[PDB]
Design a protein around this ligand. Structure first.
Ligand SMILES: [Zn+2]
Ligand SMILES: [Zn+2]
Lengths: 182, 182
RNA sequence: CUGCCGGGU
RNA sequence: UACCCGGC
């Protein structure tokens, strides 16, 4: 159920440029659903598969759970790659049909942020009740704590690794800010 | 004994970061020897060998050329990569023993220039009657015109290529000047 | 695909 | 993930 600590470090790695050994930074999504009646959170994670994308895999998962439409839920997502233009649309739709869910999205990296469609896509999310932010130490902290297996001994220092995501996320944050006001 | 236009273009490319497709930018030397009386120049080019770098296979084979010790010669070298710390030591040793030769070096790119032993080697040449400069539009012009065959039709426009070479050499020149000041 | 740090689109 | 650029 739990991501391996090496999967976390490699896949959430928001570095400017990769360090050797090189590896594909795959899409990955960490969601957590909290009811607002004072209740227990539910968690899981998705990759890209079949005819999906992790966001689309997660939209249909919610539908499966058959939630309580009389209840507001807080839905938080942690994406290594900020969403598609196409997934942007499919998410804006989804949230419009499910007003009883409060969606918030955090990206570790901004996917093709120099292209207009991905730009418009993110401005839309932020215009259509779906705030988009860059993960910072708070979000990197919560994702490590609750989504990563901590039973085995690590080949690296977790606190320094988190330190470095925090540091790298700053320039990624100013870039997202500039996109919103364009 | 004429480089092909594709070899010149690939090997003397001074872009900081390459473009696809990727290829090894290997060491290469184009040399010109001219006397001070008037006699026409002598030209050739050298590659890295297993037992000598281009600069060193070159100064070696000078004994085996039809020059005499009573005339002065101006020796100009055009290098893709700037000299070794090891080659720097041997170039100064060689110039010191041959007072009939006036050598000056021109590098397209600075080889490992963030490293002290390579920088001291460049400082050493400049301080030992061996001027080191970064190749500019004149030197790129010079080397294209005299050292590569212009029979075949080119798959690219040599004017725009030299234009970018000239544009790229500006930052690299600024880097050599800083090194020469430490 | 010489290495590193950093800014911006 | 692409490009432009600065410095070491
Ligand atoms: Zn998508
Ligand atoms: Zn050498």
């Amino acid at each position: 159920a739990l991501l391996t600590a090496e999967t976390f470090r490699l896949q959430f790695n928001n570095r400017r440029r990769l360090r050797r050994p090189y590896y594909p930074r795959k899409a990955l999504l960490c969601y957590q659903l909290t009811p607002q009646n004072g209740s227990t959170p539910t968690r899981g994670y998705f990759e890209n598969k079949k005819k999906c994308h992790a966001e689309i895999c997660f939209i249909n998962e919610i539908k499966s759970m058959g939630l309580d439409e009389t209840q507001c839920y807080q839905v938080t997502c942690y994406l290594t790659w900020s969403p598609c233009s196409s997934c942007a649309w499919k998410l804006v739709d989804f949230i419009q049909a499910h007003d009883h869910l409060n969606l918030r999205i955090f990206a570790s990296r901004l996917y093709y942020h120099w292209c207009k469609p991905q730009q418009e896509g993110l401005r839309l999310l932020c215009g259509s009740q779906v705030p988009v932010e860059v993960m910072g130490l708070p979000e990197f902290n919560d994702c490590w704590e609750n989504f990563v297996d901590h039973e085995k001994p690590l080949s690296f220092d977790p606190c320094k690794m988190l330190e470095e995501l925090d540091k790298n996320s700053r320039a990624i944050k100013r870039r997202l800010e500039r996109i919103k006001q364009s």
